[model samples]
Target: KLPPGWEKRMSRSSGRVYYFNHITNASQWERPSGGKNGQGEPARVRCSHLLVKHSQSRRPSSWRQEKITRTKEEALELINGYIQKIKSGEEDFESLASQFSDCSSAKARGDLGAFSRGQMQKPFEDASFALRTGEMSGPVFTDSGIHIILRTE
Candidate 1:
């Protein structure tokens, strides 16, 4: 079954799309902003096995991150947060990725473009295939992490 406002978006003009999944391998924590000195305070490191992915270019498909998932809950939280930021316009695809991405394309704004079905994971295809053009679906939980899907109109 599809969610409300969700519709399939496969057409001749959908252009090119790409799909990918990733996981966080490391989290470097620094002293809280203006809080303590770096001399003796305890340092924190957060790691995740959570998966993250995005559409790829029009030519070929690529898999970015291959390992790690920060427990289901944490991964979903991060994924949802990142998705919301990107969807809300508060965060540009490249900017947020510059800091929170664990993939090479993170340097390229995480632009995955367009793609056909069967080119990605089942879950990704499920969510993505269920959306209407111009509408986005989100934070859907998966073994790897949460997903924020964008559909083109």
Candidate 2:
């Protein structure tokens, strides 16, 4: 299930876990369930991801790893550790990603925005589609490096 907290108006300052019960008929500004869906669409989705690239990556250089000399296994381990922390329910995925992710997309907390099929690598797209909203994945291997995928929509 998605987290009990929901962002109603995209607050800029303090964070609050906004939630309204549909069953209880509480005051609701938007659909309490989640994003609007109709299946069989243009095959698009939104996601955020944390990447840990190593020397083995096609383009190893990143803002964090100017000369990434770490091995593939080490990159995988990094993703693995982060996934564990997220699944443990002790951390906010995006905020944590904003701090430690190696991808330049970390500029916006790893948000890749909305992308459709063929826009991202096959492994990356596949992993994103497999995840339920707000669900984090185990380490996923991609040509760029290892990834911790989160389906934000």
- Give the whole-model CA lDDT for all candidates, comma-separated: 0.44, 0.71
- TM-scores for all candidates? 0.47, 0.71
Query: Which residue runs does candidate 2 get wrong by more than 4 Å?
Result: 1-42
Give the alpha carbon lDDT tens digit for every residue of 12-100 in model 1: 57753322222111111221122223342112211111235332212112244443534555655777787667657887545665566
Query: Backbone clash tally for model 1?
Result: 16
Q: What does the lDDT read for residue 57 in candidate 1?
A: 18
C-alpha lDDT of candidate 2 relative to the true structure:
0.71
Give the per-residue lDDT of model 2 (tens digit) for 44-149: 7799988888998989898886788999988877776776677677887898789888899999999999988888888777767655576556677788988877
Leading candidate by TM-score:
2
| Candidate 1: residue 58 Cα off by (Å) | 25
Candidate with best lDDT: 2
